[PDB]
Every structure is written in C-alpha cells, then in structure tokens.
Design a protein around this ligand. Structure first.
Ligand code: CA
Ligand code: CA
Ligand code: CA
Ligand code: CA
Length: 387
C-alpha cells in the first residue's frame, strides 16, 4: 500500500445488549495526523451516548516526529497490525473493541466490533447525557471568593488583568512565561477580545469543565506549588511564601491561625488531605481559598493551549506489540465526571523497525470533535506524537 488518503469504517456490535451498526466515509493527512469521518447508522436512532465511540472511530494517519509511525510503516509494508482495546468505566461497565483493516493503495477499509456491558440503565451513557460543554454552578459566596482571587492578579486595581499583571504573578511563583505565552493564555479566555482578562471572563474560565483536566489534577498541582520542598506537608513558612508572593500580606499571628484552621490532625503542618478539605475560622478558610483559587487560575491559564488534547502513553512489550493507555473523564450534561481508562494492544504481523523500540515511551496527544444527531456523526481528529 501507500500512505493513506481515504478510509471507511464499519463500526457495529452492542451496548447493554442493544445492537448498533454505523458505516462511515472519511479522509485524512498522514503527514500531520488529521482525520475526518462521517458515520451514519444503518439501524435507526442510536440508543446510547456516541461519545463512548469517539476513541474507536486509524493510526495509519499518525506520523512520528522524523518519519512514519509503526502503524503507518505496517500499512505501507502491507503486513499490517490488529487492534484489541478494552475500556473500563467507573460504574463497572466495560467495552471491548477489535479491529480489522485492509488496504488498497491509499485506501483503508476498517471494521471495528464493539461490545459493551454493565452500563446502569439510567446512567449518562444509556441516557445520552455526555457532552463536550458544561460549567460549574457557582453560589454568590463562591463568586465572592473568585473576586478575592482575581484582586491578587489585578495589581493596579483597574478591574482587569493584563499580560503585565499575569506575568508578575506567575514570576512571583517561580514561572517565567514569555510575552507570547501570556498573550495566548489571555486570548484563550478573553471573550470580549480587548486583550485583557476581566472578572466575568475570569469567573467563566474558572467555572468551565475542561475535557482532560479535572479538580483533582488542579488541586494536586496547587498542593505542589504550596509544598515547595515536596515533603508532602505545607509548613507555616511555605504557606507564608505562597501568600507573600501572591501579594496577600499576613502577620505571623495570621499565618499561625491559617495553619491551625487547616491542621486537623494537630502536627502543625498541612498534609494533602487537609489541603483538599480547605480547598472544598471562616475568615481563615476564605484566605486559604483566595490563595488556592489564584494558584489554580495560574495552573488553568498555563494549561489552556492543550485543553482540547488527551495524552496516550505507548510502550513495546516486544518487537511485534504496542500497548497504549489513556484515561478520559467524560463530562455529563450536569457537569459531573464519568471516568474511564483504556488499554489498547497492537499486534504487528512483522517485527517493528529497531528505532521504534529505542524510542520508548512515545506520548501521543489527540484532539477530537464530535457533532451528532440520533443517526449521524461528524468526527474530526488532530494528533501529534512526541518522544
Ligand atoms: Ca489591572
Ligand atoms: Ca477581555
Ligand atoms: Ca513542605
Ligand atoms: Ca496536619
């Protein structure tokens, strides 16, 4: 075969014992990982969230940094590979997907058999209640706390955060973003386009559910900023350092009060679980949250440019096998999380070229978009592989 230009997919099987069957036409660019596919049901309206099909609906399109991926090499060779994927869901549901491909020049003919079982009859999969877009519902007190955090960034008090002000705060916390990085962070959340991050835009950014970044990740990263010496406790001096560097001036008395308020077990330091509880005496709790929200805002702004991108980690147990893993915390209509993990085993008919076995692990970042009716899916994928 040659490198791919066009592909087709027959994806079929059952979810909770209900049969589905879709047939699909697409294209992509093997030089950059791009794919697009149109799928239509042959068996009327889908009875489950098509979001669980998104990873399943063609790594022959994925290049590596300096040449072909092994997937591509196996297509060009003709000998090819087989794919076995399992997904485990937090409700105990499981899905298995097996693929076959055939190649005719630049054309891939793919078939994927999907069997999934154990989905709660009223959960988000069986009720089509998974979405790309949701936000937190904030109370007035939560909005008031975000406004305190916003004020740490708004150094001149003019009611908006500039690149100068965001850079100042990030630098105070040991991060050195470039001006272009600061402009990208702002433009990603700057709804009115003025070049600054105002309080409504700040609130909206903090309330957004990001596809591949959840509360646990943000609170874990925030703890890391406080816990400067990485010993798993925030001490009084570490708390003082974060507060001072953010611009929140505190007396020795106040630092002591904040530690005592958080320090449930009485050892004079704040462990990760005590921190989690603070981030979920009212004036001490509000001061912790002012700093915590500010730290989380920096983490969220820092990470926006890959917000739409999910990482897979690939290794080779031997010269004819790749094992890939990722995790996906789907978002529900009501802005809750629905966690899954995936494990995919690729079996190659011929041994992979030696340089693939040398360059382990590989990390592959994927962006996906799904537009769906009851009968039709429009899918796009963007991919990038890193050593
Ligand atoms: Ca300002
Ligand atoms: Ca703005
Ligand atoms: Ca520490
Ligand atoms: Ca403690």
């Amino acid at each position: 075969a040659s490198l791919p230009a066009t592909h087709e997919l027959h994806i079929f099987g059952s979810i909770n014992g209900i049969d589905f069957d879709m047939v699909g036409q697409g294209t992509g660019n093997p030089n950059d990982g791009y794919e697009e596919l149109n799928l239509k049901s042959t068996m009327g309206d889908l009875q489950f969230s098509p979001w669980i099909l998104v990873p399943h609906i063609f790594h022959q399109y994925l290049p590596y940094p300096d040449g072909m991926s092994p997937f591509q090499a196996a297509m060009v060779d003709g000998s090819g590979y087989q794919v076995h994927r399992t997904m485990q869901f937090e409700d105990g549901a499981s899905l298995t997907v097996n693929y076959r491909y055939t190649y005719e020049g630049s054309h891939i003919k793919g078939e994927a058999q999907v069997e999934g079982t154990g989905f709660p009859a009223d959960g988000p999969v069986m009720t089509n209640s998974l979405t790309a877009e949701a936000h937190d519902q904030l109370t007035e007190e939560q909005i008031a706390e975000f406004k305190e955090a916003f004020s740490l960034f708004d150094k001149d008090g003019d009611g908006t955060i500039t690149t100068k002000e965001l850079g100042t705060v990030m630098r105070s916390l040991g991060q050195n973003p470039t001006e272009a990085e600061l402009r990208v962070m702002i433009i990603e959340v700057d709804a009115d386009g003025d070049g600054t991050l105002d309080f409504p835009e700040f609130l909206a950014m903090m309330a957004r559910k990001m596809k591949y970044r959840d509360t646990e990740e943000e609170i874990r990263e925030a703890f890391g900023v406080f816990d400067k010496d990485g010993n798993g406790y925030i001490g009084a001096a570490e708390l003082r350092h974060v507060m001072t560097n953010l611009g929140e001036k505190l007396t020795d008395e106040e630092v002591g009060e904040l530690i005592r308020e958080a320090d449930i077990d009485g050892d004079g330091q704040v462990n990760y679980e005590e921190f989690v509880q603070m981030m979920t005496g009212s004036s001490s709790r509000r001061k912790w949250n002012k700093a915590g929200h500010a730290v989380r805002a920096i983490g969220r702004l820092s990470s926006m440019y890959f917000a739409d991108w999910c990482v897979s980690k690939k290794t080779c147990p031997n010269d004819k096998t790749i094992v890939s893993t990722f995790k996906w915390a789907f978002i529900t209509d009501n802005g809750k999380r629905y966690r899954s993990t995936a494990r995919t085993t690729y079996t190659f008919a011929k041994p992979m070229a030696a340089n693939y076995l040398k360059n382990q692990p590989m990390y592959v970042f994927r962006k996906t978009e799904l537009k769906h009716s009851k009968t039709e899916l429009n899918f796009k994928e963007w991919q990038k592989a890193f050593t």
